[PDB]
Design a protein around this ligand. Structure first.
Ligand SMILES: [Zn+2]
Ligand SMILES: [Zn+2]
Ligand SMILES: [Zn+2]
Ligand SMILES: [Zn+2]
Lengths: 511, 48, 102, 48, 214, 96, 64, 49, 45, 88
RNA sequence: UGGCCGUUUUCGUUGU
């Protein structure tokens, strides 16, 4: 559903007509794994059969296309590919058959599965780890740098939970060196930084009073006022939305000469979208974005005031574990984009002939199947032609030298921190690990401290719909930001969800 | 554990560098310590 | 696509079969002739893909002698040679021929 | 002892002289000119 | 006379732009279709023609009178590298970008097509149509030893000997002219209709075996 | 000679060509092409581009780790083996 | 110190690329541009946050 | 016969052993050189003398 | 001359390297060879 | 041809289960047609020279692509002796 | 009747 439509057009003039080909993606169909011999004979396949014959426990998939034609003078169940299935999962033969049949089917009742098979090699997925998304962290940079504090945030769309953009606020200036302590923001798809005040103005709050009240919620904290004052001092050449936006668009990393005609809208696009995408993308909701910027800068300054500690980059609560689910999701998305572009190109060099395509010579299901097969075959978690620069070692031959070894191998973790530069913060243990990872287990040598193991009562969140949650919050008197001001709600409790500010409330304890 | 794992490689590197540096110094008959070219580093090895 | 020997216009063989040459069907008789005549007047081989849309003043159009020939795909070079019958018929009607193969 | 009989006298290396190659030197030493990208004559053995 | 048609300053300018490799023909036809569709519209495409020469692979030229005209002639094309890599052309070079640019009977030629690729021959007879040329080859036949081919399992070559084919495996037409399975064998030499695309007549470097035989 | 660039028999009868031999052949191709520009239309720009390509081949043939610019690959996408690699690193001829 | 920048900007009028120099004069808050073929120049006040891209864009807007 | 082994052998000051361990128990080879250019290019045919 | 044994129906038969590799009786596609006839020894140690 | 022995194969080229194998012994004799008599080359699969035991269970089925596709599970028992490893 | 030929490159896991 991410890209549910393919669209073409034809302003054929030879009599001017606009012929539109619009292909729509519909429902997905999944099948139980099935063998098809070279003889054309087909039969439901079983794991043991696979191991014996170097097969692949895979479920061919059928997707519902929808071919449509729109001429203006002014599909079916399509076989797309084969997804390997993890044994004992809901979509494997063995979920049924109870124990007695397993003996018939030559699979030990003890083996808990949980792994895939490809060419007869029992490959396993080592769950990876990543820093939590939609969260604000503060890092002091090294002394030999005009940057003193950094407020990095990696935003990812809640739906899917996929990386979109990464943003940083850098507190420039040194101690009586660098003159005033200017704050210059960094934005996506640009080659140069921008002052904070400029982005405040270009997003709707042009006047200084609104800007300072949004950033600051402690008026008596004169230090904040005087430390952001240099930004105010330099933030006077810009006084309206428009020159601010053009300033942004004048450094849009785009072509040269997009003029004030289209450059302003380029800036408005790069501001509405590509910026804090996890919050929103529609117009008329810049209030949320401005409030979030204000919170970010307030926290950054507070860290710059040493009134609170910088978050520990090894803190586990800020760490998230990627299981097989999302990993396969991302790989499938890459293969899906490739398939979509394949179909679009075939439409290009088959529609001009105006020959009705069969949706069968076009869709090359070989792409998905070969891609997934090779990816899990070598673990090079990406397309073959980009073997280099590809996260490696995420799929490995399962170890069955003993039952306990196999049990451990299926609860392993990993860290994508590499080894170029030893350091010790990533490798060492931490207090937060209490009751979530084994304080006793880890390999030896280069990986010592990286590869972890979940405790004996660990559990991984799969995600729940937040819409009922917000409904409850909204059901319970939460006060939107549009009724928020530092003066009034100086003791009311801000409310956050999934890392995104989502309201204001005064009496939280009952809530 | 981490400390040992880190220290071993660094010690190996330092030992390699040193060995490469002094690898050519030898003691001739005259009692003077010269590298390949003939530079004299100690006129009497170790001063004894 | 087969390029007409005289004007150089190249269009799908179905176009010549159903409509002849856009410029030379009046003198070459491609639309209402046998397949041999069309094939010899339009060989599958051509070179110099020149996309001409404006020719009344285009320098290249004058160069190739396609200023009068309707703008389109024209063949700078064509291999082979026409039979004797087509050349003789064209010379009879006032059309001295010049292959563009160069 | 491993090598067969050879008439040339046997001695050791004393000096190594570095320095580039004069193109006439290369021509004086090369025994062939390379002109054919096709390594294998016609896939009929006997490379070109 | 083409000599009095030489270009001038008042003739339209030309810019040579790079596009996606191999899809130069696609970009050329896209340009033609845009010009034909935008011919006379309120914003007509200000070009005279677009052309590509095979030797200049990846290079596309559009005849316009302003840089933005070339930009919009190449705009809206995915088969073009997004860069506006265009370079002007000298007056003498304008005609050099459109210059178009040895098959005789008894000429030693080699084959490249099908099973008999890489075999030198003599061109025998050229059809009137001018697309197929007869060749004189040394057959590579198996005399019904394994009949119950490609360019990698093929046995060696040898002139047709009628006696061997008679003894092992044949409609004699004339003295030395044998029709054997749709193949013409004159005086022991293989004769077949070879498409001119399948043969090489220029730049043939005779080999040791050819000196021994030819 | 081949002594320095022997070929790898992937599976006995199947023989694959040394990457150095491929780079040598590609340099020969670029050279031959550079020969056949002056005898036909050579609108300056083409000659310069082809010259740069030949220089690029002969360079990556002798160092595939030239700073600042992308490396050369095989049909497999893996970076080429220039002689500088053959001599440097732990596995160079010296330390190897 | 005046910097003479031979930026890759193209000139609108003389149909030549890299024939445009967007000189910087911050001393008096003045913009200067030098062309190489038609030698045209553009003048405009510049502030601390203005850059050759900004001068070029303002020049384009003025020309149109 | 890694670096460190070579260094230990040097330290024990055993020359000839190190020589042969790196010569006869490894790629022992013979060549010819021209005394003028000093290079190995001398084309020789031993049996042909 | 070269006996076999099915993995699904466990009925014996043979083949002469020309028949397709399938069970004659139940059609199954997994087979095993059977024990040789020369004598097998163990020292029980 | 290899330097090892072939006699333990069957008449069709596979070794029967229950036969003892030794180092440098051929267990699977495969032949490749030679691109042009005497036009075949050994493509055997000799046992790892550092192993011994008895062949136990020979499998012979088609691959995904319909060619013969064999598997030989040789076995032996490891007696602890001088030079093993153990751990509490 | 001597004579006699078994890949590389990656990545992984481990071992001291
Ligand atoms: Zn015509
Ligand atoms: Zn100018
Ligand atoms: Zn010499
Ligand atoms: Zn059976």
């Amino acid at each position: 559903w991410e890209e549910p439509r393919l669209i073409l057009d034809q302003p054929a003039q030879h009599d001017n007509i606009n012929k539109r080909y619009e292909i729509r993606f519909g429902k997905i169909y999944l099948s139980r794994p099935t063998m098809t011999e070279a003889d054309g004979t087909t039969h439901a396949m079983f794991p043991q059969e696979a191991r014996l014959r170097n097969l692949t426990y895979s479920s061919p998939v059928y997707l519902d296309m929808e071919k449509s034609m729109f001429t203006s003078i002014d599909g079916n169940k399509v076989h797309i590919g084969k997804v390997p299935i993890m044994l004992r999962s809901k979509f494997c033969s063995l979920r049924t058959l109870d124990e007695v049949d397993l003996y018939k089917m030559k699979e030990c009742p003890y083996d808990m599965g949980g792994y895939f098979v490809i060419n007869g090699s029992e490959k396993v997925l080592i769950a990876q780890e990543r820093s939590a998304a939609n969260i604000v962290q503060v890092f002091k940079k090294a002394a030999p740098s005009p940057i003193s504090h950094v407020a990095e945030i990696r935003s990812a769309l809640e739906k899917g939970s996929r990386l979109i953009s990464t943003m940083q606020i850098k507190l420039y200036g040194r101690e009586d060196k660098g003159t005033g302590r200017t704050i210059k923001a960094t934005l996506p798809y640009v080659k140069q930084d921008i002052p904070i005040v400029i982005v405040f103005r270009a997003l709707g709050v042009v006047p200084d009073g609104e800007i300072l009240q949004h950033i600051c919620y402690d008026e008596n904290d004169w230090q904040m006022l005087e430390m952001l004052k240099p930004c105010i001092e330099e933030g006077f050449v810009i006084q309206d939305k428009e020159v601010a936006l053009d300033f942004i668009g004048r450094r849009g990393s785009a072509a040269l000469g997009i003029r004030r005609e289209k450059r302003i809208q380029y800036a408005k696009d790069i501001l509405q979208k590509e910026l804090l995408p996890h919050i929103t993308q529609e117009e008329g909701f810049e209030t949320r974005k401005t409030f979030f910027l204000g919170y970010m800068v307030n926290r950054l300054l507070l860290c710059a005031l040493e009134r609170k500690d910088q978050d520990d980059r090894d803190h586990f609560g800020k760490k998230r574990l990627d299981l097989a689910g999302p990993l396969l999701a991302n790989l499938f998305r890459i293969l899906f984009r490739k398939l979509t572009r394949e179909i679009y190109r075939y439409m290009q060099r088959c529609i001009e002939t105006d020959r009705d395509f069969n949706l069968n010579l076009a869709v090359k299901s070989t792409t998905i199947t070969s891609g997934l097969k090779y990816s899990l075959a070598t673990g090079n978690w990406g397309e073959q032609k980009k073997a280099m620069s590809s996260r490696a070692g995420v799929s490995q031959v399962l170890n069955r030298y003993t039952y306990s070894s196999t049990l451990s191998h299926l609860r392993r973790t990993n860290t994508p921190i590499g080894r170029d530069g030893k350091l010790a913060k990533p490798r060492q243990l931490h207090n937060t690990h209490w009751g979530l990872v084994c304080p006793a287990e880890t390999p030896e040598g280069q990986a010592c401290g990286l590869v972890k193991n979940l405790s004996l009562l660990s559990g991984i969140s799969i995600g729940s719909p937040s819409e009922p949650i917000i409904n409850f919050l909204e059901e319970w008197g939460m006060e939107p930001l549009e009724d928020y001001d530092p003066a009034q709600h100086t003791k009311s409790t801000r409310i956050f969800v999934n890392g995104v500010w989502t309201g204001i409330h005064r009496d939280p304890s009952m809530l | 554990l981490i400390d040992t794992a880190v220290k071993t490689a660094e010690t190996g590197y330092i030992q390699r560098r040193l060995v490469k540096a002094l690898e050519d110094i030898m003691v001739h008959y005259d009692g003077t310590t010269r590298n390949s070219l003939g530079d004299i580093i100690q006129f009497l090895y170790g001063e004894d | 696509e087969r390029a007409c020997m005289l004007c150089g216009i190249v269009l799908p063989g179905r176009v010549f079969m159903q409509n002849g040459c856009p410029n030379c069907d009046s003198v070459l008789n491609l639309r209402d002739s046998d397949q041999a005549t069309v094939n010899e007047c339009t060989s599958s081989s051509f070179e110099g893909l020149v996309a001409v849309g404006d020719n009344e003043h285009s320098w290249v159009a004058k160069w190739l002698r396609v200023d009068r020939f309707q703008p389109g795909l024209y063949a700078v070079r064509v291999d082979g040679r026409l039979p004797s019958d087509i050349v003789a018929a064209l010379e009879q009607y006032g059309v001295y021929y010049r292959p563009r193969d160069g | 002892s491993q090598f067969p009989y050879s008439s040339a006298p046997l001695r050791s290396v004393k000096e190594v002289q570095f320095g580039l190659l004069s193109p006439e030197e290369i021509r004086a030493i090369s025994v062939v000119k390379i002109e054919y990208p096709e390594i294998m004559d016609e896939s009929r053995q006997r490379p070109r | 006379p083409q000599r009095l048609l030489i270009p001038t300053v008042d003739d339209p300018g030309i810019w040579g732009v790079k596009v996606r490799l191999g899809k130069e023909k696609d970009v050329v036809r896209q340009i033609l279709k845009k010009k034909l569709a935008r011919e006379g519209t309120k914003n007509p495409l200000e070009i005279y023609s677009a052309f590509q020469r095979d030797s200049f692979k990846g290079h596309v030229y559009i005849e316009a009178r302003k840089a933005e005209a070339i930009n919009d002639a190449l705009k809206g094309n995915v088969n073009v590298f997004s860069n506006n890599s265009k370079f002007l052309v000298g007056i003498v070079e304008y005609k050099d970008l459109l210059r178009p640019v040895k098959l005789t009977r008894g000429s030693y030629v080699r084959v490249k097509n099908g099973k008999f690729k890489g075999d030198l021959a003599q061109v025998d007879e050229v059809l009137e149509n001018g697309l197929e040329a007869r060749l004189k080859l040394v057959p590579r036949l198996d005399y019904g030893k394994d009949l119950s081919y490609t360019s990698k399992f093929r046995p060696a070559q040898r002139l047709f000997s009628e006696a061997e084919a008679r003894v092992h495996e044949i409609r004699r037409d004339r003295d030395g002219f044998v029709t054997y399975g749709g193949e013409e064998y004159y005086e022991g030499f293989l004769y077949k209709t070879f498409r001119l695309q399948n043969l090489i007549v220029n730049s043939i470097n005779p080999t040791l075996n050819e000196l021994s035989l030819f | 000679p081949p002594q320095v660039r022997p070929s790898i028999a992937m599976d006995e009868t199947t023989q694959g060509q040394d990457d150095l031999t491929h780079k040598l052949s590609d340099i020969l191709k670029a050279n031959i092409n550079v020969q056949k520009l002056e005898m036909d239309g050579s609108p300056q720009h083409i000659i310069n581009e082809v010259e740069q390509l030949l220089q690029f081949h002969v360079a990556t043939y002798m160092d595939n780790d030239i700073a600042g610019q992308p490396q050369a690959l095989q049909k497999s996408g893996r970076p080429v083996k220039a002689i500088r690699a053959r001599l440097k690193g732990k596995e160079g001829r010296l330390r190897g | 110190i005046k910097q003479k920048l031979e930026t890759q900007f193209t000139c609108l009028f003389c149909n030549h690329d890299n024939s445009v120099v967007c000189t910087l004069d911050k001393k008096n808050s003045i913009g200067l541009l030098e062309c190489k073929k038609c030698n045209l120049s553009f003048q405009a006040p510049i502030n601390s946050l203005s850059q050759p891209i900004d001068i070029y864009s303002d020049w384009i807007d003025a020309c149109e | 016969f890694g670096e460190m082994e070579r260094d230990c052998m040097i330290a024990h000051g055993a020359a000839g052993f190190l020589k042969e361990r790196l010569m006869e128990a490894s790629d022992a080879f013979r060549v010819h050189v021209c005394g003028i250019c000093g290079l190995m290019s001398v084309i020789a045919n031993l049996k042909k003398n | 001359g070269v006996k076999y044994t099915c993995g699904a129906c466990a009925h014996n038969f043979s083949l002469n390297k020309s028949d397709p590799v399938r069970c004659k009786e139940c059609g199954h596609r997994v087979i095993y060879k059977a024990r040789t006839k020369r004598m097998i020894q163990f020292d029980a140690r | 041809l290899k330097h090892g022995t072939y006699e333990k194969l069957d008449e069709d080229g596979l070794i029967a289960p229950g036969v003892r194998v030794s180092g440098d012994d051929i267990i699977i004799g495969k032949t490749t047609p030679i691109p042009p008599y005497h036009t075949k080359r050994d493509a055997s699969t000799p046992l790892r020279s550092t192993e011994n035991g008895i062949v136990d269970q020979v499998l012979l089925t088609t691959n995904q692509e319909g060619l013969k596709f064999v598997k030989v599970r040789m076995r032996t028992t490891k007696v602890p002796q001088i030079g093993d490893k153990f751990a509490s």
